[PDB]
């Protein structure tokens, strides 16, 4: 039994000012490098413990001892994501009901049905790049976000955001980004009832209303038309939970659609951006991935079966997730009094944060080459120990979208490597912007077409 390390304090504000930064996850990573596998973090009326080692995270991932916690971030996002799957407690009736209805819509088998819609948006990206002039470059996170938002709009509810037709996001996206920004900024407000923030509160309510009205109108329009599409909205209007026998109601469907749009905007776009970053910084890896794309994607339109054969493209994605897990943390609570790691007594309800970037740098699992980008670490999935690699979270609360995200990212990265050579023309210095997720800010490349027809 051991005292937990704690970072530097600021009198009555305890550790809270350490996260008064636009890069709090990176700040916690530097704290974990200084203090090790566990540290306590105190704020007025709150204590969290940050876990970094596979030894402790494997215990935290025991669902008999720990359940998903809503972090204060997720509590603030719940003001517009409601009791959708991501912001619901495991014990809320709507969690298991939605989970049971939606699991079959997210299976590897279901990806066959979404493939044609993913191709539609991926071909729009490839055409955009084919149409750049010689003196032009690509804004990588900007284009990847146009792509993944459009893909989930089309597969989610047969709605075209038409992000490749725009400089300025669809108004829904404006309100969604600003609501996400307000949720994350509120973590840093030592005193949020100061009238200074009355404007933030009013803007936040107006952004929620924009989001509810598009989504409630889309649900209403689809029920009126009676149309049956191969999208998540049709599955949610028709599906019944085998346990309760109930379908989702319209309000909960709206929370799911908002949740899926947050995911498409924030996550897969980050993964593709990091993956392209690591490929242009590691040309041997780029050559090996481009060889696979050329050999496998032999048709102008990739098929579902061809995407499944892009093994090395999948290893590149996993290695990018290892170094920069675009969703960088998840929160747990102790279901009962327990001892973590034989050393750290916890009380029922005590909150843990898993720092996924630190888990993925545990040299006792990965070896001393942990900072190097080496997709070959993933050549043999069996060799990865349990709970060493957690970019999609844990157990029954793991990412329902994992097969969707990886199918889209593999398809798109495959097509990018088939169609273009890439240049790191600025010698880009990695600068990681934080929202809910991580993205490489300002990452730009030049593409040179291989002149292969679509
Ligand atoms: C590379 C892409 C993505 C990554 C890294 C990612 C990561 C994660 C992580 C870490 C969690 C666990 C959150 C927690 O424990 O608090 C999660 C949950 C979830 N993700 Fe994803 N995700 C991705 C893509 C998507 C997509 C495309 C969708 C939907 C279209 C989606 C929908 C969800 C939902 C609904 C949950 C909550 C599941 C539940 O608790 O029942 N994700 N994701
Ligand atoms: O560890 C953090 C800051 C990084 C969250 C990153 C997280 C946000 C969700 C999506 C994945 C990434 N937040 C904790 C602790 C906390 C609480 C109040 C004020 C300050 C910190 C929390 O939100 O409970
Ligand atoms: N995927 C889930 C669902 C939406 C989101 C946002 C940030 C981090 C993880 C997630």
Curated annotation (Swiss-Prot):
Annotated site, Important for catalytic activity, chain positions: 267
Substitution effect: residue 263 to C: No effective fatty acid oxidation. No effect on electron transport from NADPH to FMN
Effect of mutating residue 81 to W: 800-fold binding affinity for laurate as substrate. Low coupling of NADPH consumption to laurate formation. Very much more effective in indole hydroxylation. Favors omega-1 hydroxylation
Effect of residue 329 to P: Enhanced activity with small non-natural substrates with altered product profiles compared to wild-type
Result, substituting residue 267 to N: High substrate-free turnover rate constant. Negligible substrate-induced spin-state and substrate-induced heme reduction-potential shifts on addition of saturating concentrations of arachidonate
Subcellular location: Cytoplasm
Induction: By pentobarbital. Expression is negatively regulated by repressor bm3R1 at the transcriptional level.
Binding-site list for heme: 399
Result of changing residue 46 to Q/S: 2-3-fold decrease in binding affinity for N-myristoyl-L-methionine as substrate
Reported effect, residue 400 to P: 10-fold increase in binding affinity for lauric acid
Annotated effect of mutating residue 85 to E: Ineffective covalent modification of the heme macrocycle. Extensive formation of Fe(II)CO complex in the substrate-free form
Family of this protein: In the N-terminal section; belongs to the cytochrome P450 family.
Functional note: Functions as a fatty acid monooxygenase. Catalyzes hydroxylation of fatty acids at omega-1, omega-2 and omega-3 positions. Shows activity toward medium and long-chain fatty acids, with optimum chain lengths of 12, 14 and 16 carbons (lauric, myristic, and palmitic acids). Able to metabolize some of these primary metabolites to secondary and tertiary products. Marginal activity towards short chain lengths of 8-10 carbons. Hydroxylates highly branched fatty acids, which play an essential role in membrane fluidity regulation.
Name under which the protein is recorded: Bifunctional cytochrome P450/NADPH--P450 reductase
Source organism of the structure: Priestia megaterium (strain ATCC 14581 / DSM 32 / CCUG 1817 / JCM 2506 / NBRC 15308 / NCIMB 9376 / NCTC 10342 / NRRL B-14308 / VKM B-512 / Ford 19)
Gene that encodes it: cyp102A1
């Amino acid at each position: 039994i051991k005292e937990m390390p704690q970072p530097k304090t600021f009198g009555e504000l305890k550790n809270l000012p350490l996260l008064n930064t636009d890069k709090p996850v990176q700040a916690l990573m530097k704290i974990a490098d200084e203090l090790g596998e566990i540290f306590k973090f105190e704020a007025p009326g709150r204590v969290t413990r940050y876990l970094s080692s596979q030894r402790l995270i494997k215990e935290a991932c025991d669902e008999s001892r720990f359940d998903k916690n809503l972090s204060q971030a997720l509590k603030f996002v719940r003001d517009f994501a409601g009791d959708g799957l991501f912001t619901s407690w495991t014990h809320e009736k709507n969690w298991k009901k939605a989970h049971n209805i939606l699991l079959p819509s997210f299976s590897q088998q279901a990806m066959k049905g979404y493939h044609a819609m993913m191709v539609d948006i991926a071909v729009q990206l490839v055409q955009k790049w084919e149409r750049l002039n010689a003196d032009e470059h690509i804004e990588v996170p900007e284009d990847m976000t146009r792509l993944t938002l459009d893909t989930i709009g089309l597969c989610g509810f047969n709605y075209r955001f038409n992000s490749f037709y725009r400089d300025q996001p669809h108004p829904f996206i404006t309100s969604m980004v600003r609501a996400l920004d307000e949720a994350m900024n509120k973590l840093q407000r030592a005193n949020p009832d100061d009238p200074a923030y009355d404007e933030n509160k009013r803007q936040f309510q107006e952004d929620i209303k924009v989001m509810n009205d598009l989504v409630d109108k889309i649900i209403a329009d689809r029920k009126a038309s009676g149309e049956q599409s191969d999208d998540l909205l049709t599955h949610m209007l028709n599906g019944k939970d085998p346990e309760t026998g109930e379908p989702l109601d319209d309000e909960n469907i709206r929370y799911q659609i908002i949740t899926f749009l947050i995911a498409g905007h924030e996550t897969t776009s980050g993964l593709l951006s990091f993956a392209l970053y690591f490929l242009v910084k590691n040309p041997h890896v780029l050559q090996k991935a481009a060889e696979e794309a050329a050999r496998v994607l032999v048709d102008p339109v990739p098929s579902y079966k061809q995407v499944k054969q892009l093994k090395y493209v999948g290893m590149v994605l996993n290695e990018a997730l290892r170094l920069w897990p675009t969703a960088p943390a998840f929160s747990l609570y102790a279901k009962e009094d327990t001892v973590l790691g034989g050393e750290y007594p916890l009380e029922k309800g005590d909150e843990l944060m898993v720092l996924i970037p630190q888990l993925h740098r545990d040299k006792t699992i990965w070896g001393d080459d942990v900072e190097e980008f080496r997709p070959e670490r993933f050549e043999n999935p069996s060799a990865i120990p349990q709970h060493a690699f957690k970019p999609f979270g844990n157990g029954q609360r793991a990412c329902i979208g994992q097969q969707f995200a990886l199918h889209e990212a593999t398809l798109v990265l495959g097509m990018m490597l088939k169609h273009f050579d890439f240049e790191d023309h600025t010698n880009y210095e990695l600068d990681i912007k934080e929202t809910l997720t991580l993205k490489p800010e300002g990452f730009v490349v030049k593409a040179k077409s291989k002149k292969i027809p679509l």
